[PDB]
Amino acid sequence: SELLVNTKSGKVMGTRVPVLSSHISAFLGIPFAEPPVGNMRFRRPEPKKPWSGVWNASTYPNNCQQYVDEQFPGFSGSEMWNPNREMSEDCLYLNIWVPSPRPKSTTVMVWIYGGGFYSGSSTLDVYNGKYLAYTEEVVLVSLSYRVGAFGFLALHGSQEAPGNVGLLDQRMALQWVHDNIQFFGGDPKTVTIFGESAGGASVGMHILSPGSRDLFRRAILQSGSPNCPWASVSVAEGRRRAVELGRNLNCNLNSDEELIHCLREKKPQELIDVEWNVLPFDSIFRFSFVPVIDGEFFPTSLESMLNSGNFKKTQILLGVNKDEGSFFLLYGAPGFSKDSESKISREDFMSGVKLSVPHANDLGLDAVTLQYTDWMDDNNGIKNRDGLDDIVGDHNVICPLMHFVNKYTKFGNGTYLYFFNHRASNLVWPEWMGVIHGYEIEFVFGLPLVKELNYTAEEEALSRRIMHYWATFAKTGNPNEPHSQESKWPLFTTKEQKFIDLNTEPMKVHQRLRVQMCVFWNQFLPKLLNAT
Amino acid sequence: SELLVNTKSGKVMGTRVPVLSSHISAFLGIPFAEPPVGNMRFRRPEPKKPWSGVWNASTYPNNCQQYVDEQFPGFSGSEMWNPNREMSEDCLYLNIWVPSPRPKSTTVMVWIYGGGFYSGSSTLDVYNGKYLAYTEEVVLVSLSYRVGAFGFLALHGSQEAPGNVGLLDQRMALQWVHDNIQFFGGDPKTVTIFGESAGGASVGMHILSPGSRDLFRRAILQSGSPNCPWASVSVAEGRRRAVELGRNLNCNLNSDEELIHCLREKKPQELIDVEWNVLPFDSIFRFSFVPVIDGEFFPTSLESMLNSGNFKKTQILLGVNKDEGSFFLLYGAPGFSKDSESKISREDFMSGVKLSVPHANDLGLDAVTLQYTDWMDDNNGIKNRDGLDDIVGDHNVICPLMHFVNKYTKFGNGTYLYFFNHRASNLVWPEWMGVIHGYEIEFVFGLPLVKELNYTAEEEALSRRIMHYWATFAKTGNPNEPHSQESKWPLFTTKEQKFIDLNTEPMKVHQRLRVQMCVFWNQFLPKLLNAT
Ligand SMILES: COc1cc(CNC(=O)Cc2cn(CCCC[C@H]3C[C@@H]4Cc5nc6cc(Cl)ccc6c(N)c5[C@H](C3)C4)nn2)ccc1O
Ligand SMILES: COc1cc(CNC(=O)Cc2cn(CCCC[C@H]3C[C@@H]4Cc5nc6cc(Cl)ccc6c(N)c5[C@H](C3)C4)nn2)ccc1O
Ligand SMILES: [Cl-]
């Protein structure tokens, strides 16, 4: 009864799940779109046709077709991110965790997974919404969206493969939440979207996109922003990559209709097998099929929208991790290894810089090298390693986010900024990688509250603080509880630019997050590359 | 008798001068060239014709015609550098201080004054060679040379104003020392030339010039090097400035012969009155008439000579002061004043950068600004002031000297490098100016040994250490006395790049003097400006 919900598309039957020492309801694998299969591959999603009978929402759905990381087989640190369900193009489902007893009209949070727009699953253990829904009394939704070529192959001008359809998948799930979350006890006028990495970029893209803005109230962006250099391409570059994808699969390339028809006859794994072959440069932190600046989802360039205030004005909470670059260097840069401290030679440093800034000319590469090299101590393998780590994280995550924060705050209604720099005590990744891209998520989703997962008591307390910040922000637009005597997370303002550290020690307020390096990345290096 | 010396140009009669609690002999105002007056203005010097009778060498000679600093009338800090004798184009004389009793064959040191190639006198109180000659038992020579347009007006191709004649003045004095210092008790095979600022650049130019190299044994360069950006111009730029000088004086400009003839009829002060009007840029630390890269005194570019080892291979001792830039900012940059702490606004900082790097385009100016700005604290007037101080000293003195040191040491026979960072207790200049350009000279010449000058006992001890370093280097090629248990000043080597601080505390050895900034000035910024 508590597990049966009538929605506008039909009835759904959930399941009662244990969480800590209580229970909540879960509605898993609810369809929000028609299966984008067959001649619907690459096309914009269509709403799910209403169904007769009762939809069995007791088990997780399929994951979308995607590249699977096999670099460390059996290693939990990498396999925890891989699809844990069967992959299928039939994958547009969402999941809902609902407090028990069912609320009347409570705050909703919608999670958008990341994964470079080429990977991601709503069903990962680390995305289990039951601890957040139970602890903070929110309705927690996780959506899914097509990734890779399936979600982002872009042949602008065509209506069969227009690009951005993964983002339209996200939007269709938000539309379904807007239309139906009331029946689960959610308040559709108090929806917060939040996401990490490409999901953080996606959140920012719905803030910008006129077609998405009305479908949520406020937003949280973790380690990703819409202006990140990896997060979008021009329509010309998307077309070049789509044509190169067909060339890899022996397709007729004489027209969009012939190319799209050829690509639609291929099995999913044949696209995945060649997807990485279309990148224009030898690079790390660059992905083949990503959002395209198309003039429809995004009416103009991202920079001109941010400059003019052409975006949703609301409250945002966002931040970054200390060592965003380390994951990408481990997988893609010579000299880095999982089982060594990865001290980097001068030659491997120069190779890494070239991989990390693929669009740079030799003068640009010299500028990056000078900015990040201690010339009193240039053969220090630890400083070279940490310098490359900083280059990758500053260029790809931190400095684009700081540019976004400063543009947004001029027109927005409240900005809260964090710097997550706690390394978990039970981390299976080597110590040189520090505070890794993606490893704040387990604190946001409350995994340290689970005794068997071997976190410390301080880490459980940190997780509870973070979950309460997130859910209080979602509820009110302010992560701070009023009338409480805890230290206050201050607003980020244009003038004072305050942020907080997120770790196990007492809260410290700082100003101008990595301002020196972000002047280099956001102002000087673009000017240098444009003049040369 | 001890005061009478027969030389190859004739007899000279010196004077007995008191020094501390003893006496030495002084031979002041000995002519080494014919007076470069009349139709000899701008021409290469001619040897002084031998004279009958006894030359009265008991009084200082005239100083060369030059610009006189009147920015702080009556202020000893600036007036101590001005001519202290009557100015005259009849000014090619040298001075000799000789220990008593007259030595047989002792080390000779020849001082070359600086002053931006536009000023300087051999007769300044701070250049009095009697303390060094007495204390260290050397024969101390100070020469003179034409400065300004008189010494450096350059119309390449003409034999009436070929350029570089001030450097040929220096060379003619060195030739006279080579030919005659034996009669004063000097060893002509153990001559060290030393000089500060433009005199340091000049010393380096005689190391490079094939026509000068045979006239001395080893060399000391203080706060100046031949490759400094202010120390030379091309023949085209020298010609442009000579023509502009004539335009300022209503000269016929249709041929070299007409221009030179017009310039030779002008009184000296009319040239001096307009000399600063010919500079191509709004600048500081740039001078109108300087050595020209002519293909004769310098056979090729300074850089190609340093790269190929086309220079005298010997021992060198050289170094810089901590705050070389402060003097130039005080006189030439907005926001700096003698009687205030000169806290610099953001706007005056940007004006100062533009003055300090006049050849830079806007991208180059942004690169300099980023390198020297703390963007966590960019409105700190003390940091802006000290940042400009560092820009001026790094660009104009320290980084060119470090480029010279590293090129020279590849082929040379021994390099000793110092960093003078002691601020004298009795300095009359404000504290913001720090360790000023030129203020190591009083320690080299032993002024702290004079009780009435109000130095401390530690500063007398520092002066004695420096004088002993200099004279022991002059004597042996090594500033360290063998068999002594004092801490050793190590050789500067290509690999370890060691240097010492010179101050009142116990000697400390460091490595890679200002290497971070000099990579910027010597490698990155030239590459940036060449590509743009
Ligand atoms: C793998 O083999 C090669 C790899 C390369 C180098 N490849 C690349 O540079 C392509 C690339 C791939 N990526 C990864 C994008 C990030 C996707 C995810 C983001 C989210 C957080 C996260 N963090 C992880 C951290 C570690 Cl240590 C390990 C796995 C992580 C992970 N899967 C995720 C997911 C995916 C969610 N960046 N660049 C070259 C040649 C190769 O043969
Ligand atoms: C003075 O009026 C103006 C001045 C300017 C600015 N002028 C300039 O930038 C031209 C310039 C002149 N200079 C000086 C070159 C250095 C020459 C001397 C070097 C040696 C060491 C020395 N140090 C001194 C330190 C102080 Cl604090 C004061 C005087 C010093 C001094 N005369 C010397 C001499 C000269 C020997 N650099 N740039 C613009 C407009 C003006 O009306
Ligand atoms: Cl680390």
Ligand SMILES: [Cl-]
């Ligand atoms: Cl200072």
